[PDB]
């Protein structure tokens, strides 16, 4: 997808209170951005990093600018606004960048199915229903990507739900959208949430497919393109 209109740049002073960031624009003035990420944002919010923000045109809200990307001091692009993940995924399924998910005749979003909600469900006359859970990956240590970047009991629960989907003979996919341009491989963060990492291995055992695709990212746009090796 393309950022429309294109993003503007600034220099980070600090992210604070989770949802706010003070930045300095190219004119040397201060500006407060909405930070649409509630997580730790490890490696994504270093004072002095360049940030890229969008502008909401027709709103009277207090902070009509949103922090979209970080361009780290080592030159890497990071999409900190992980609220784009589902859209990038849908776009990549439909344009067939994600080959493992081609050959379905319909795509539905936000499907409530059980006594739980799935990000996408793919369907076809000849095939079992395909359930896709989308996860965002912004944690990098050099080239190694990790999820989660803090313990997640909610993540653990959804992972268990996917196992039930597979057990019932549906196709079940967990899809890690990799939003940091430095990442070249993916693993669960066993060192951070050991239980999640264990559940991820167990889900694989029980037939949940695990994919990780990397986004190409610039101030102009982002697109999921490249598949990445996963090591449990
Ligand atoms: Na999700």
């Amino acid at each position: 997808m393309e950022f429309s209109p294109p993003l503007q740049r600034a220099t980070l002073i600090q992210r604070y209170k989770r949802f706010l960031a003070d930045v300095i624009t190219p004119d040397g003035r201060e500006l407060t951005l909405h930070c649409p990420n509630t997580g730790a944002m490890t490696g994504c919010a270093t004072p002095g990093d360049t940030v890229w923000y969008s502008t909401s045109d027709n709103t009277k809200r207090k902070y009509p600018h949103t922090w979209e990307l970080t361009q780290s001091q080592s030159g890497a692009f990071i999409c900190v606004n992980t609220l784009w993940a589902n859209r990038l995924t849908k776009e990549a399924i439909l344009n067939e960048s994600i080959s493992e998910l081609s050959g379905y005749s319909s795509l539905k979003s936000e499907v409530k199915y059980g006594a739980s909600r799935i990000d996408f469900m793919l369907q076809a006359d000849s095939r079992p229903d395909c359930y896709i859970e989308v996860k965002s990956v912004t944690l990098a240590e050099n080239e190694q990507g990790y999820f989660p970047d803090a313990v997640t009991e909610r993540g653990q629960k959804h992972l268990r739900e996917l196992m039930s989907v597979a057990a019932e003979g549906q196709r079940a996919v967990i899809f890690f959208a990799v939003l940091h341009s430095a990442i070249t491989r993916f693993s669960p963060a066993r060192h951070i949430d050991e239980k999640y990492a264990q559940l991820l291995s167990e889900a694989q055992q029980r037939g949940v497919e695990i994919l990780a695709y990397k986004a190409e990212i610039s101030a102009e746009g982002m697109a999921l393109k490249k598949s990445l090796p996963v090591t449990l």
Side-chain angles (χ1 to χ4, degrees), residues 67-101:
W67 188 353
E68 306 288 355
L69 315 175
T70 292
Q71 187 178 354
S72 79
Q73 279 154 69
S74 51
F77 274 89
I78 317 164
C79 175
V80 299
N81 184 0
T82 66
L83 304 177
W84 291 115
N86 285 27
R87 157 88 82 100
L88 291 177
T89 299
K90 167 168 167 165
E91 161 185 283
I93 292 176
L94 298 177
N95 70 12
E96 288 174 322
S97 301
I98 308 159
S99 277
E100 296 82 0
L101 299 171

Side-chain angles (χ1 to χ4, degrees), residues 13 22 36-37 42 72 78 126 130 149 153 171 186-187 200 217:
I13 300 163
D22 285 353
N37 193 314
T42 304
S72 79
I78 317 164
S126 61
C130 182
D149 78 346
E153 283 170 51
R171 189 184 181 193
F186 173 83
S187 298
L200 193 59
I217 304 167

